[PDB]
């Protein structure tokens, strides 16, 4: 009946002065916009149908046309930024917010879905959805004694839309909007559905991707132990954002970093640093690099958890991006560590894989490794053991690599390599 209509027939039906003809034509548009291969979104926009669909959202007396027009508009809003703008320009934001209070669950859900797509476009539309007052009615849909009574798909859509209101920077979401959403987000983080847990973790990862004041708002809510629990989940869609959030928190203050260590996060790192997914190994090594950038007692916890051999591991063999993060973890450790901690790093076999990476065609990793070598030599100077280290670097072919770097195109590499040869290899 409403399958494979032309755009011309949809326009004729919607322009009729007959509500049932308009309903049939709107359903036909929804089905056209729902097809898997190339839905004619631009053709529907060019036919001037977005203002008609938006007016149909307000037809309280005809719930089927509210649903069909909400679905058609959600399909358009899910497209390119230009296509999402066409929906916003048609006045859809207040019309969708008014539908959040619909007594029909399938209509309310469609409005949740549409607002998530609009807010997900970027910072400006996210902030515009917030200004039109979407947060209060969205949170009211989750104000139930137990989240388990809500329909699974409905709860997943609400969580995803809330995550989009937490997403994007320049600027980050309004502080009061973040404070308003955070108690519901904390509750969703303790739910048992994997998709709700993944999107709640993504929301937390967005909120912690910023200055220390942004991280503090989250950490103050006591979510760090729950994030560490999810970091240990078997589902990769949960581990990925839980690791991102933990990684973001340790970019903060020493005290925020300490909350991560106190919650037992380091006990998961033997598996994360050997994870078969390269992005997990890479972001886990980045997280380690920010912990080794901490206090001497925090570097000591890395040592106590047996993680230095795991850092030697990723430096020895891993995807290059992970090896670069491992080089940063070592340079940070050698910058802030005690002589005893630096001695321990050498005893774990850091020298040979650190020297092997001086052959890489990446100036940034060369700079980071040369800084680590200088830091280790400074520790050896305090013990009068510079000769033992010089021979160690010589034996694994490290001297040949540092000598060749004296004629490198980069100024900082040239200077640092000439300095090491003149100070310890002459």
């Amino acid at each position: 009946g409403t399958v494979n209509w032309s755009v011309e027939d949809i326009v004729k039906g919607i322009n009729s002065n007959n509500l049932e003809s308009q309903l049939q034509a709107t359903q036909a548009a929804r089905k056209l916009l729902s097809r898997e291969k190339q839905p004619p979104i631009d053709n529907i926009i060019r036919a001037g149908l977005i203002p008609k669909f938006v007016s149909f959202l307000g037809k309280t007396d005809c719930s089927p046309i509210q649903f069909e027009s909400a679905w058609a508009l959600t399909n358009i809003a899910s497209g390119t930024s230009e296509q999402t703008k066409a929906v916003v320009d048609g006045g859809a934001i207040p019309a969708f917010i008014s539908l959040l209070a619909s007594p029909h669950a399938h209509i309310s859900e469609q409005a949740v879905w549409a607002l998530g797509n609009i807010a997900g476009d970027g910072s400006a539309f996210r902030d515009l959805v917030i200004k039109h007052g979407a947060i209060d009615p969205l949170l009211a849909l989750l104000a139930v004694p137990d989240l388990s009574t809500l329909a699974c798909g409905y709860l997943r859509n609400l969580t995803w839309t809330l995550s989009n209101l937490c997403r994007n920077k320049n600027p980050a979401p309004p502080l009061d909007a973040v404070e308003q959403i955070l108690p519901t987000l904390v509750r969703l983080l303790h739910h048992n559905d994997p998709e709700v847990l993944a999107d709640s973790c993504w929301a937390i990862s967005y909120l912690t991707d910023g200055p220390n004041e942004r991280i503090e708002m989250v950490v103050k809510k006591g979510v760090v132990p729950q994030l560490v629990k999810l970091l240990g989940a078997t589902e990769l869609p949960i581990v990925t954002p839980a690791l991102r959030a933990i990684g973001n928190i340790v970019t903060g203050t020493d005290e925020q970093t300490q909350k991560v260590i106190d919650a037992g996060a380091l006990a998961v790192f033997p598996s994360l640093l050997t994870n078969p997914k390269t992005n997990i190994q890479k972001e886990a090594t980045w997280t380690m690099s920010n912990i080794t950038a901490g206090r001497q007692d925090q570097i000591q916890q890395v040592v106590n958890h047996g993680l230095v051999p795991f850092l030697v591991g990723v430096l020895s063999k891993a995807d290059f991006k992970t090896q670069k993060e491992a080089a940063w973890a070592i340079t940070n450790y050698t910058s802030g560590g005690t002589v005893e901690q630096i001695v321990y790093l050498v005893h774990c076999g850091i020298i040979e894989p650190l020297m092997n990476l001086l052959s890489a065609k990446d100036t940034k990793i060369i700079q980071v490794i040369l800084d680590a070598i200088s830091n280790i030599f400074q520790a050896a100077e305090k013990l009068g053991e510079t000769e033992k280290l010089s021979i160690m670097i010589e034996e694994c072919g490290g001297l040949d690599k540092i000598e060749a770097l004296q004629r490198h195109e980069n100024e900082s590499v040239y200077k640092a390599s000439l300095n090491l040869i003149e100070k310890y290899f002459s």
């Binding site: 991707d209 970019t251 903060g252 980045w286 940070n332």
Partner: peptide, 13 residues
């Protein structure tokens, strides 16, 4: 002295 904290964008961007 001490190591430097690096954001997600500083590390991978």
């Amino acid at each position: 002295s001490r190591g430097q904290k690096r954001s997600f964008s500083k590390a991978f961007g």
